[PDB]
Design a protein around this ligand. Structure first.
Ligand SMILES: CC[C@H](CO)Nc1ncnc2[nH]ccc12
Ligand SMILES: [Cl-]
Length: 167
């Protein structure tokens, strides 16, 4: 039993809700919130910009030190950093950005990072401003993640399409 509320159950382990991931994280304070990151951990817009803003830019400051030490992530890769005021940890995961020409096949590799954590609050990887088909992202999530994932879909209209079209 966990403190996530109002989710629709899609499979044994995948749940979904129309919600703002920032407001969800502040309410639940999950062990792990997933950020839709880029390789430079530059949290400018989309989910990343919103999460970072909610941390008063502390996420960006921590991220800049991480990059200065370790260099960029790989597309499909991840790193664990602080969750600041939002969660215990933030798992920064880089899905392929179609608006940069990156290989959508890397989306499965990106979701594999979730399997290292028993429970996660997450957005749909490569959706929104990353330019991939969200229906496809949800399918890859369900077919790749085996741990317990609580998906927050910001756009109510898109949420309804994802539910109604889910196989
Ligand atoms: C990734 C595509 C979805 C479509 O809604 N984007 C989001 N989902 C949940 N929380 C969010 N916070 C800011 C953006 C955002
Ligand atoms: Cl987005």
């Amino acid at each position: 039993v966990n403190s996530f509320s109002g989710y629709l159950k899609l499979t044994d382990n995948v749940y979904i809700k129309n919600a703002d991931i920032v407001e969800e994280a502040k309410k639940v304070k999950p062990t792990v919130v997933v950020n839709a990151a880029n390789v430079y951990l530059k949290h400018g817009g989309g989910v990343a910009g919103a999460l970072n803003k909610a941390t008063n830019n502390a996420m960006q400051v921590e991220s800049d030190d991480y990059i200065a030490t370790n260099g960029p992530l790989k597309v499909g890769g991840s790193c664990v950093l602080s969750g600041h005021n939002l969660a215990k940890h933030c798992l920064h995961v880089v899905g392929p950005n179609v608006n940069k020409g990156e290989d959508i096949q890397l989306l499965k590799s990106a979701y594999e990072n979730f399997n290292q954590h028993e429970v996660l609050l997450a957005p749909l990887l490569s959706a929104g401003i990353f330019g991939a088909d969200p229906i496809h992202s949800l399918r890859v999530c369900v077919d790749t993640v085996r741990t317990n994932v609580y998906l927050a879909v910001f756009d109510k209209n898109l949420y309804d399409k994802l539910v109604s079209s889910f196989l």
